[PDB]
Structures are given as C-alpha cells and as structure tokens.
Amino acid sequence: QNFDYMFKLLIIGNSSVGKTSFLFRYADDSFTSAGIDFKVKTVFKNEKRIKLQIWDTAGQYYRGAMGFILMYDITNEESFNAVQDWSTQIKTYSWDNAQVILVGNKCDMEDERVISTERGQHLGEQLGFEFFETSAKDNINVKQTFERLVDIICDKMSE
Ligand SMILES: Nc1nc2c(ncn2[C@@H]2O[C@H](COP(=O)(O)OP(=O)(O)O)[C@@H](O)[C@H]2O)c(=O)[nH]1
Ligand SMILES: [Mg+2]
C-alpha cells in the first residue's frame, strides 16, 4: 500500500500473441482457454516496494513508460517479422530511460513452433533487448520477464 517507486509498464506486439494472457497470469496467477486497460501489482526488490502499473492497450501513449514487454508468438512468423516495427516505434516515441524485454510467447506449443529459440536470442542481441521464451498457459518465464524488467529499470534509475 506504501510503495517507494511506481513503474509504468506496457505490453506490446501483434494481436493473438498472448499480451492479455501474459498480464492475467502475472497479476491474477490465472489462465483460461475460455474493459481492463491496466492491472496493478506491488513487488519487493531488495528492501524497496515497487508498484507496477502494467498496461495492455497495444491492440486499441508511450512517452511515460519505464518498461516495455515486446511480445511475438513462436507459432506465428508474422508476429516475429512485426517485432522490428514495434522496436522502431519504441526507440522513436519513448523515454530514452525505457527498458525492453523481447518475449517469444507460447513455448508450450512445441509442435507448431516456426520461430527457433536462437532466432529469438539473435533478434534480441540485434535490438539490444534481453530475451525470454514464455507461456502464459504453462506459467513459464512470466515471473522472470517482469522481475528482470524491474531489475533493469532499477539499474537505469540508479544511473
Ligand atoms: N498455447 C498457448 N496459448 C496461449 C498462450 N497465451 C495466450 N494463448 C492463447 O492465444 C490466444 C490469444 O491470447 P490473448 O492473450 O488474447 O492475445 P492478445 O491479443 O495478444 O491479448 C488465446 O486463444 C489464448 O488463450 C500461451 O502461452 N500458450
Ligand atoms: Mg488483448
């Protein structure tokens, strides 16, 4: 209730890549196969209490963002080819303090994977964004994405 810091976080990427599910898995530790612009979660980093305002309005503005989660779907090449456009919109129309994690979502759908782990890692290195493969569905690397984002926002905040 009594936080030291508040970070504005945006989830961006093409529609159907799992932006909304990623948010719902992190904030309500839920996912379902079956109105909300943002959700709030408070996290503990070192002794600090950090309020996260996590926005999910990409599929419907950037200047204030501490942090971006740039999502593509590993089962959809179009979502991954689009990452460059998304990255361009970030580095242009954002606070030059903003951190970014590249996220290949739905790593649970191994049979329909069209994007390799290493293509993802390689695009990460090209764009200068750390990278995680995730599943909102199986709860894989959702926690680690947000906490890594908080950590690097803190590092930059300290500089
Ligand atoms: N298999 C799998 N499906 C997912 C995952 N995340 C989301 N989905 C599904 O992919 C579709 C798009 O989800 P949604 O979160 O609405 O995508 P958004 O349009 O980017 O918000 C829905 O059918 C979800 O149930 C995941 O990690 N694994
Ligand atoms: Mg959505």
Side-chain angles (χ1 to χ4, degrees), residues 15-16 18-21 56-59:
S15 16
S16 281
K19 294 187 295 295
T20 305
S21 315
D56 177 37
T57 75

Side-chain angles (χ1 to χ4, degrees), residues 66-96:
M66 278 74 163
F68 289 90
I69 293 164
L70 207 181
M71 285 202 35
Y72 69 88
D73 174 351
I74 70 157
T75 75
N76 176 291
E77 192 155 29
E78 192 39 51
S79 79
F80 177 81
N81 296 326
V83 164
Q84 193 80 227
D85 295 299
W86 291 113
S87 185
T88 304
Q89 283 181 35
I90 282 169
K91 305 223 195 194
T92 289
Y93 295 93
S94 94
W95 192 11
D96 73 82

Side-chain angles (χ1 to χ4, degrees), residues 15-21 31 105-106 108-109 135-137:
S15 16
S16 281
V17 302
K19 294 187 295 295
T20 305
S21 315
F31 170 94
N105 201 227
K106 317 193 188 176
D108 58 290
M109 304 293 288
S135 175
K137 184 164 188 309

Side-chain angles (χ1 to χ4, degrees), residues 11 18-19 21-27 29 68-72 74 100-108 113 117 121 130-150:
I11 312 178
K19 294 187 295 295
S21 315
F22 201 86
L23 177 55
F24 264 79
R25 168 63 71 177
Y26 187 57
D29 175 36
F68 289 90
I69 293 164
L70 207 181
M71 285 202 35
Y72 69 88
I74 70 157
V100 189
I101 289 146
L102 184 59
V103 165
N105 201 227
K106 317 193 188 176
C107 58
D108 58 290
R113 169 193 287 277
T117 299
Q121 293 168 161
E130 303 196 6
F131 173 78
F132 287 97
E133 283 201 322
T134 71
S135 175
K137 184 164 188 309
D138 290 355
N139 192 14
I140 306 179
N141 273 348
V142 184
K143 255 174 161 169
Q144 283 79 2
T145 290
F146 276 107
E147 295 177 331
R148 185 60 195 157
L149 190 47
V150 166

